[PDB]
Ligand binder design. Structure first.
Ligand SMILES: CC(C)C[C@H](CNC(=O)CCCCN)Cc1ccc2c(c1C(=O)O)OCO2
Ligand SMILES: CC(C)C[C@H](CNC(=O)CCCCN)Cc1ccc2c(c1C(=O)O)OCO2
Ligand SMILES: [Cl-]
Ligand SMILES: [Cl-]
Lengths: 149, 149
């Protein structure tokens, strides 16, 4: 549970926003890329896994699941790759709504930055800091508890 | 204390590695850029601050301290910008040695990746996971304790 993340890819301004969500907390990391490739996804996972203890990733589609580069990165980082098929239905609708909510925040900050990538990082900030505890607080508490086990 | 980070810039393969160290834990985040500019530093801080609760940053040099873009990003993200002058001497030598240690790990993984940026992320992974607790475990414990205050 503390180690489970879900990949999510959404589109804005002709570009792609790649998102990783920590399922138990709602905490996100995100980046802008020109298009979703196995190489970009693999690199994104390597960054994620050096920053948080990533045990399991629910991949966002079959092409990334199949990607030899994604597989290599998951092997390297000790990540168990899984399908993002809604084996659990509470995720797929929450993702749709997360994308909507993230895009809403992006629109709210968009005029404060020249580049989309900057607006996306501002939106990540706002998302992770917003008190319901915040997602940032929740992920830390979840993982801290897990270290004592 | 839980919110204090230090910026560090080091060189390898004709490129620049920008590093943020969580002082109390030794946890790092890092990125490769062609050269250190205020714009790159500002963007790096925006990413950092959306991921961890950054209260204070000891900037790595005077040009970044002065940078209007760095100042803007620190204002936006609620970061108190400080000089990285060794007001405390336990940092400057530990940074020199951290750069040496990071470069050592980079050399150990370098042949496993085509691009330097990838090797740097692998090195971040190894650094943050290495059990002394690991830096990754320490930062989480430090921040979790601070949330209860
Ligand atoms: C996850 C890693 C083990 C491999 C993985 C794939 N690279 C190779 O197979 C090339 C090996 C070069 C041998 N000299 C590394 C990697 C992943 C994602 C990337 C990469 C790289 C890379 O630098 O090779 O560049 C940017 O996006
Ligand atoms: C920290 C932010 C408030 C500002 C900050 C500077 N940008 C501006 O002043 C332009 C304002 C555009 C108004 N339409 C945003 C920023 C920081 C660092 C960057 C940036 C940007 C940006 O996208 O403007 O691009 C990549 O590196
Ligand atoms: Cl970690
Ligand atoms: Cl945070």
């Amino acid at each position: 549970s503390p180690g489970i993340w879900q990949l999510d890819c959404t589109h804005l301004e002709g570009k792609v926003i790649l998102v990783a969500v920590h399922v138990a907390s709602g905490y996100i990391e995100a980046e802008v890329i020109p298009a979703e490739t196995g190489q970009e996804t693999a690199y994104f996972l390597l960054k994620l896994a050096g920053r948080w203890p990533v045990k399991t990733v629910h991949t966002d589609n079959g092409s990334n699941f199949t990607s030899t580069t994604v597989k290599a990165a998951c092997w390297w980082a000790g990540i168990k790759q899984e399908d993002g098929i809604p084996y659990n239905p509470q995720s797929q609708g929450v993702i749709e709504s997360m994308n909507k909510e993230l895009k809403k925040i992006i629109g709210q900050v968009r005029d404060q930055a020249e580049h989309l990538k900057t607006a996306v990082q501002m939106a990540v900030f706002i998302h992770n800091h917003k008190r319901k505890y915040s997602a940032g607080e929740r992920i830390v508490d979840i993982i801290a508890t897990d270290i004592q086990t």
